[PDB]
Each structure stands twice: as structure tokens, then as C-alpha cells.
Amino acid sequence: SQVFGVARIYASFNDTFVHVTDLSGKETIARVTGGMKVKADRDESSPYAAMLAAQDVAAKCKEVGITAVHVKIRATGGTRTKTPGPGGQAALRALARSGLRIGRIEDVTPVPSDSTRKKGGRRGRRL
Amino acid sequence: KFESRKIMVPPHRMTPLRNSWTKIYPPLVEHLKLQVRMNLKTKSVELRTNPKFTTDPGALQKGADFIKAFTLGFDLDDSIALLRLDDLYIETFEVKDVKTLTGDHLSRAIGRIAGKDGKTKFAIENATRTRIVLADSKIHILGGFTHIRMARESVVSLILGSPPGKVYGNLRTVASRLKER
Amino acid sequence: VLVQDLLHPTAASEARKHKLKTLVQGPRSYFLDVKCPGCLNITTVFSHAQTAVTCESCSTILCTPTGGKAKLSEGTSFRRK
Amino acid sequence: PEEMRKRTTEMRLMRELMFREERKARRLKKIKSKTYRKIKKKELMKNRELAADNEDHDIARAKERMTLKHKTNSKWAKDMIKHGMTNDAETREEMEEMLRQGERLKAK
Amino acid sequence: VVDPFTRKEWFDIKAPSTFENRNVGKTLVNKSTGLKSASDALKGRVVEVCLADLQGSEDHSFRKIKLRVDEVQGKNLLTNFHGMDFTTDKLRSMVRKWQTLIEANVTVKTSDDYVLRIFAIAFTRKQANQVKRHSYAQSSHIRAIRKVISEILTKEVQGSTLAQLTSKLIPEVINKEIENATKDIFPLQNIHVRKVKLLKQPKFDVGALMALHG
RNA sequence: GAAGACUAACUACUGCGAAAGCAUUUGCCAAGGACGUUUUCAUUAAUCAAGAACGAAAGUUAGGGGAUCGAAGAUGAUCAGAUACCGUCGUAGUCUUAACCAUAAACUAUGCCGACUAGGGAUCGGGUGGUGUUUUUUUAAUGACCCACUCGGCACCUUACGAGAAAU
RNA sequence: GUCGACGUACUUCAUAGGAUCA
Ligand SMILES: [Mg+2]
Ligand SMILES: [Mg+2]
Ligand SMILES: [Mg+2]
Ligand SMILES: [Mg+2]
Ligand SMILES: [Mg+2]
Ligand SMILES: [Mg+2]
Ligand SMILES: [Mg+2]
Ligand SMILES: [Mg+2]
């Protein structure tokens, strides 16, 4: 009946990658970033850029055979933030509003059983 | 086109869910054409779009965003604002994700973010048109993308050490250059 | 009641205080007398034992040590001395 | 019965009320920082006055004249004055506060 | 200059015997050229299926399964069992304040000699007239529970091959055995096994694999 | 797959240690406080110039290791404002064995031992009591809770009869 | 050498508070 693929949404400060692969993970069918869809560098990570990214991927994969996706959304993780920002959820919203069928949303950020140092020093990084 | 979500409920927000349920299932059912069901035998809300009634494909994720924003700690009306508009996102971060603090230092950091009688928190919300809930250490911000980057930059300038008077002053400057645009 | 006699405290009061803090201090254990079923003869056993007291003739066990009062083995009869 | 389960949920909610209040009071007990305690005392005296007989005043004046406790022959004040330490205006704030409190008592 | 989805050919992943919905889904390879035949490019993939979508259930909405492709025949490719896991959101929602967390693992070799390492989690609970609010254990209980859990996992793995262990993991029998054998020590809600992962697959033995989908 | 650090959530400034400090499992080694005691010795004690053991982080000597972060250094930008003064590579270090060094807001800005002085609710450890609840084996018995008590800890509330100029 | 670290000697900066009246 249906054909399923996975949509991996990396949602960093400074981009959002919408990847769509198979179940297996290896073969990829559609990568777009957010950076391909706005040529201003202000706002590679802006929600609007993410929306355009996701619409392009949904179109391209609908032109293959693939009608439903499970989504795996992740922030940077590691020793940085661990929760998807706005770029990932804008991509998710604009992916559900696309005629794809979505099942089984989850969230796989890498989370350490405590790990190495964090960039920045004794006084914290960003302000 | 029959489709679902299911989102879990942590226990400190399970009393206010079964305490404000009466205002939640209506603007999920008629206005959205969406079929709620709350499981208790796994403590979780479940939603399903039924193929007959529904029109907007974004209804299912609209409702899931609404309930989840109620889950993270935001009051009912604010989550309703997440249900209505199309420009509302949440950004969550920590206190150990800016500067590694622990011991008493961390409880004093939350004291500077929250201010006495909530004042400092409210100032950041009122001059940025966002809504902040400040959990154990994790801090959650609701608004539109540019506004939450303004409020994130003030909160992070408060974690790292800057006093609160400086952030009122810089906040009202931000309010000036926000309200004109 | 700020005159209840320190020289005559009611036995409930002296019964709940620590053993070193009653008016004239004294022990709170007792010696209890024990018969194992198999023999007839009896032996005296401290209530708070620290040695597993083998019966004398039918030499098995009568009590096991605990952190406090001894745990009497269930196949036993006893009478407080 | 089942009314026991009602009793247990009542004692549960009392215990967690007790624990939240005790956690708050611990964290506040550690903050000694004389501006923070000074602010809390100021707005307390304001709320005390808003929200919430001569004989008590005459006993208080009598004890104050018997004792003369609020003049600069006291150990703290004579220490501060005699070692030029009250020219800094904060400890002069404190010393004047002592003196006016004593002057409130001696008024008739 | 390519448009790569002109040449890739779909295949379909079939679950093993010990599951209800044996069909799983499709996957892409490349066309089977001479000089890089396709079949030698399928034979190591692992696939993640959430076993609700593999057993029709819905209280199995956590517990992803990893299935590994090992054989291929005529646009069917037959799989195996690679490991099992929880979804990270259930696991984040069990772990709460004012209670203690007991965890245990073990390394164990099965009947068919698959060496595998298997995890286990458990949490204490407030017995239903407890008033005091936390109920931690006393850490000389926790070593008793850890030893009990480890003895039961060791015993109950290696009296089974792999298929039997798999179908002792689906109806969650190990949970009930842990629960019964560990309630004179301490109350202990929420027992699970939360992970199992292979470390040494022995040697191929086509007979077992084609005995599953036989 | 390799490597070297680190032990998140649970996690409570509650627990332990003379302090510095200590958070994955399992075993081995030796040690420790409190409790219980109708055991034992019988003043063996308290505080201590000299003298001695230990003493975070940084730092030196000689080997090992060198993943991450990174004093110095080198470079990119120096775009009104920097409000939003940083990017990139990184030697020493960070880790460890054997010797050095002997300092911290080493904090309770508070010497140690002994006595007395008030009311309460909680929590950690030990003990005593209970025809209380569950864990039933089939009724026990432990274990887990509940209630009362008691010794010994870390803290909290309310009042002083008291103390202070006041915070307390 | 209008040199540094000390050791002596000295100088200087921080004083008004309440009440009534205008
Ligand atoms: Mg000396
Ligand atoms: Mg050192
Ligand atoms: Mg070093
Ligand atoms: Mg070296
Ligand atoms: Mg670097
Ligand atoms: Mg030394
Ligand atoms: Mg310290
Ligand atoms: Mg010193």
C-alpha cells in the first residue's frame, strides 16, 4: 500500500538539514539544507528558509515513490544544546502540511553519559 | 488520512491538565475538527485526525504543538495563542549550556533570571512580546523567531553574570528599536 | 507541671526515658530462662546475647545475636526471670 | 476501608507542603547580604504599619532612662567614633538610626 | 547528468518468523551491474522498526527493534535480529526525582553462541500507604536487587537460543519474573530491560535463517 | 573500529571523611562513626610552644600518554554601536607513575573540650514497643510502610525569659 | 639617577540627623 522513508532533520544554529533516506538509512533520496534556499547568510537558520527546504524535499520525494515518512529530528547535541530549536519544528510543520503521511515522530539527539569539555572556558561562551 | 499523535504528560502538569480540561477539548474539537482522547492508562494525550470532517492538513500538528506547549509549562491562554497563529515557536535551553554552574551558584543564577516577585522575568516578556517559563533549570521561551532571539540574548546575558539593572536598560533600548518596526 | 516532683517522677516518665537518664540509672535488659524441646533442662540466657548460646546437653542453638535483643530460635520456650 | 486512602492522600499533601516551605526557607536562610535583608525589612515595616496605651510607653521610657543604651557611650558606637570610621556615611547612617530610635523612646 | 533514481531497484524487507506483521517495507539499492553486483551491497544493513508497527500492538509504541539483512532472494531480502532498544522519550519520562534508580547489565552467551549484552532498569516506589515522600532504598538492598536481576538474566538467556529469547522479550515475561522474585527485598516499580545488543555473531549457518522464514 | 578523558538524568548542598574532598559495576584488602550491652581496665583525661602526617587548582624535575578544552603564540576582522568585542589553528597544560611546592573568599568572613537554657514539625543511622497495613505459604518470618519512644547527626520554623546598634 | 621594595615621620579626603518656622 504505502511506501515509507525516514526524514532526518538536523536543526542547528546556523542551518537546518532536511534529509530523507530509506528505512535502512544508507541510501539517501533527498537532501536539502536551509542554506540552498536563501542567499543572504543572515538567516540560513530562519524558519522561513526551513519551510522552503521542507517543501522542496516533500516535492522531490513525492516524485520518487515515497508517500510516508517517519521523522527523526535532532539538535546539535554532543556538548552543546540538546533540544531542537525553531528551525527543526518549522521544517516539521511544513513537512506535515504537504500530503506526506507522517508516523512515529521521535527525537534523537546525542546525550552523553557525562563527556568531554565544552568549548568556551571557565566563563561561559555566548552572550 | 486517518492519522494521530500521542504526547506524554509529566506529572506536575497532570493536575492542571485534568483541572483545565474543560477549556481544552472544545477548541481542539469544533474549531479544529480533530478527535481528542486522553489516555490515563499511560498518562498521555492522544490526538487523531478523522478523514471525514477535517480540512486543514496542518490541524494535527497545530493541536500537537498546542498540547505540548501546555505540557512544558505555559498557561492555557498562551498555548491557545500557539493554536491560533502561524508564527509561534518555542526555544528551550539550559543553564549548564551557557556556563557550567552548580552548587549555590546555580540557584543564584535562577534568582537573577527570575528577579524579585518575578519582576525581571516579566520585564523580559513585556518588552519582547514573548512568554518565558523557567523550570528547574531548563528555560523555555515562546514567541516569534526574532523576538525569541531577543529574549534569548537577554536571558543569556543574565546567566553569565551581568547585573539586572543593566539588562533593564538594554531591554528598553531593544523595546524602542522593536516597536518602530 | 514546673512543679511535678523531680524527686517523684511518674513511672510512665521514667519508663520512656533513656536508661542513663532516669533518676537513678539502671539496666533495661533482663535474664530469661529457656528450655529447648528435646531435652528437659533449662538454661538462663541474657536477653541481649552476643554469643549463639548452644544448649548444654542437646547442644544445638537457642538464640542468635542481633544488633539488639537476641533472636530466640522458634523451637523454644522461655520465662522471664 | 477506603477512607484510609483519603487519609493518606491528606497526609501526603501536608508533607509536600511542608517540604516546599522548608526548601524555600533553607535557601533564604543562606542569603545574608545586608542590602537584601535591609530591603526586606523596609517593606515589612511598611506592610506591618498599614495592615496591623500610654502605660507601655511610660514603662519603655523608664527603662530607657534607667539604662541609657542608645547613646554613643556604647561599645559599638564608641568604637566607630573614636577610630574615625563613622565619617564614611553608611556607618553614620547606622549610628544616626540608633540615636533617633533612642530619641523616639525618650519622647513623651 | 545522472538522475540516480533511474537505475535503483526497489526490494522489500521481511521480518523474521517470530513477529506477526512479517512485512516491513521497501529499500533501494542500485541496479545489479556486473562489476559490483547488488547482492553484495545489501548484506549488512540494519533497519529500525518500532515493534508496534511489527506486532500490531500499541503498548509496544516504545521498544524499537533493529533487524539486520543477512540473505537475499528475488526481490525479497531476509532479516535477522540485531538488537532492541527503547525510544528516548519513554526513558526520559520514567526517571523522576525523589526515587532511586537501579540499573544492571550482563554479558551472556546463548545456546546458538551469540554473545550479547543485555541491560535492565528498575525504580523504587512508595508502598500504598506510605506518607513520607521519597522512598530511596538503602544501598544494601540495591546490591541485593542488582545481584538478583543479574542472576535471572544470566539464567534465562542461556537456556534459549535466540528465537526463544526473542519471543521471551516480546510478551515481557522477564519483567514479571524479576517482579515476583524481588518483592521481599523492596517494592520496586517499573521494571524493564531497555536494551539488548549483540557483540559476536558466531558463524553464518544458513539453516537457522532459512528455518525462520520457512 | 581505534584513542584518551569523563561518569549526565536519578541528585536532595541530603550521605561520608580531620580538612582538602568523594557519584558506573564487581571483588579483594585494611579502616571508621553511631547504636546495643547487668563485658573489661580503673583516671588512663582536656587543650597544646618544639616536632610530625595530609593539604583544591595552578606550578617545577624525570618517564608514559596526548581525545577534548586551552595561559603563550600565530592569524581573520577591525563593519558608526560592539549594546550583540569576538572567529580559526594551537606549544605548555589538562591525564598518569616517582619526587617537589605548601598556597585559596582553604568561609560558618564565626578556636577546641565541659555544663545549663523552649516549643514544634520533618529527615539520615541504630535500637525498643505494637492481636496496626501489605509482601501469604496455607497462618507464619523477615523485608517495605504506619504509629509511639529513645540515643547520635545535617538542617528548618515560632517565640524569647535572654543578646545586639542592627542584620540577626 | 627627579630609580625600586621596605623601615620611620607626616599630610589629606570622607559629618551631619530629626522637629518647627519661611
Ligand atoms: Mg607547629
Ligand atoms: Mg595538585
Ligand atoms: Mg598538574
Ligand atoms: Mg612531562
Ligand atoms: Mg581547538
Ligand atoms: Mg609534605
Ligand atoms: Mg571550599
Ligand atoms: Mg591564610
Swiss-Prot record, chain B:
Effect noted on mutating residue 143 to D: Accumulation of aberrant 22S and 23S rRNA intermediates
UniProt entry tagged with the keyword Membrane: no
Alphabetized GO MF terms: rRNA primary transcript binding; unfolded protein binding
Main location: cytoplasm
One Gene Ontology cellular component annotation held by this UniProt entry: cytoplasm
Intracellular or extracellular location(s): Cytoplasm; Nucleus, Nucleolus
Assembly and oligomerization: Component of the small ribosomal subunit, ribosomal RNA processing complex (SSU RRP complex). Interacts with NOB1.
Protein name: Pre-rRNA-processing protein PNO1
Full-protein interval shown: 93 to 273 of 274
From Swiss-Prot, chain C:
GO terms for biological process, alphabetical: maturation of SSU-rRNA from tricistronic rRNA transcript (SSU-rRNA, 5.8S rRNA, LSU-rRNA); ribosomal small subunit assembly; translation
Gene3D superfamilies, per the entry: Zn-binding ribosomal proteins (2.20.25.100)
GO molecular function: RNA binding; structural constituent of ribosome; zinc ion binding
Zinc finger annotations (C4-type) as residue ranges: 36-58
Posttranslational modification: The N-terminus is not modified.
GO cellular component: cytoplasm; cytosol; cytosolic small ribosomal subunit
Primary localisation category: cytoplasm
UniProt-annotated location(s): Cytoplasm
Sorted UniProt keywords: Cytoplasm, Metal-binding, Methylation, Ribonucleoprotein, Ribosomal protein, Zinc, Zinc-finger
Cofactor remark from the record: Binds 1 zinc ion per subunit.
Residues with the S-methylcysteine modification: 39
Source species, domain of life: Eukaryota
Co-factor requirement: Zn(2+)
InterPro entries: Ribosomal_eS27, Ribosomal_eS27_Zn-bd_dom_sf, Ribosomal_zn-bd
Biological function: Component of the ribosome, a large ribonucleoprotein complex responsible for the synthesis of proteins in the cell. The small ribosomal subunit (SSU) binds messenger RNAs (mRNAs) and translates the encoded message by selecting cognate aminoacyl-transfer RNA (tRNA) molecules. The large subunit (LSU) contains the ribosomal catalytic site termed the peptidyl transferase center (PTC), which catalyzes the formation of peptide bonds, thereby polymerizing the amino acids delivered by tRNAs into a polypeptide chain.
Family designation: Belongs to the eukaryotic ribosomal protein eS27 family.
Misc. remarks from the entry: Present with 43300 molecules/cell in log phase SD medium. There are 2 genes for eS27 in yeast.
Protein name: Small ribosomal subunit protein eS27A
Swiss-Prot record, chain D:
Top-rank lineage group of the source organism: Eukaryota
Subcellular location: Nucleus, Nucleolus
Family according to the record: Belongs to the UTP14 family.
Note: Present with 1470 molecules/cell in log phase SD medium.
Assembly description: Interacts with snoRNA U3. Interacts with MPP10. Component of the ribosomal small subunit (SSU) processome composed of at least 40 protein subunits and snoRNA U3.
Role played: Involved in nucleolar processing of pre-18S ribosomal RNA.
Name this polypeptide is given: U3 small nucleolar RNA-associated protein 14
Gene symbol of the encoding locus: UTP14
Swiss-Prot record, chain E:
GO biological process, one term: maturation of SSU-rRNA from tricistronic rRNA transcript (SSU-rRNA, 5.8S rRNA, LSU-rRNA)
Keywords of the record: Acetylation, Cytoplasm, Isopeptide bond, Phosphoprotein, Ribonucleoprotein, Ribosomal protein, Ubl conjugation
GO cellular component: 90S preribosome; cytosol; cytosolic small ribosomal subunit
Subcellular location per the Swiss-Prot or TrEMBL entry: Cytoplasm
PTM summary: N-terminally acetylated by acetyltransferase NatA.
One Gene Ontology term of the molecular function aspect: structural constituent of ribosome
Miscellaneous comment as given in the Swiss-Prot or TrEMBL entry: Present with 92400 molecules/cell in log phase SD medium.
Oligomer and partners: Component of the small ribosomal subunit (SSU). Mature yeast ribosomes consist of a small (40S) and a large (60S) subunit. The 40S small subunit contains 1 molecule of ribosomal RNA (18S rRNA) and 33 different proteins (encoded by 57 genes). The large 60S subunit contains 3 rRNA molecules (25S, 5.8S and 5S rRNA) and 46 different proteins (encoded by 81 genes). eS1 interacts directly with uS11 and eS26, which form part of the mRNA exit tunnel.
Family: Belongs to the eukaryotic ribosomal protein eS1 family.
Name the record gives this protein: Small ribosomal subunit protein eS1A
Organism: Saccharomyces cerevisiae (strain ATCC 204508 / S288c)
Range within the parent protein: 20 to 233 of 255
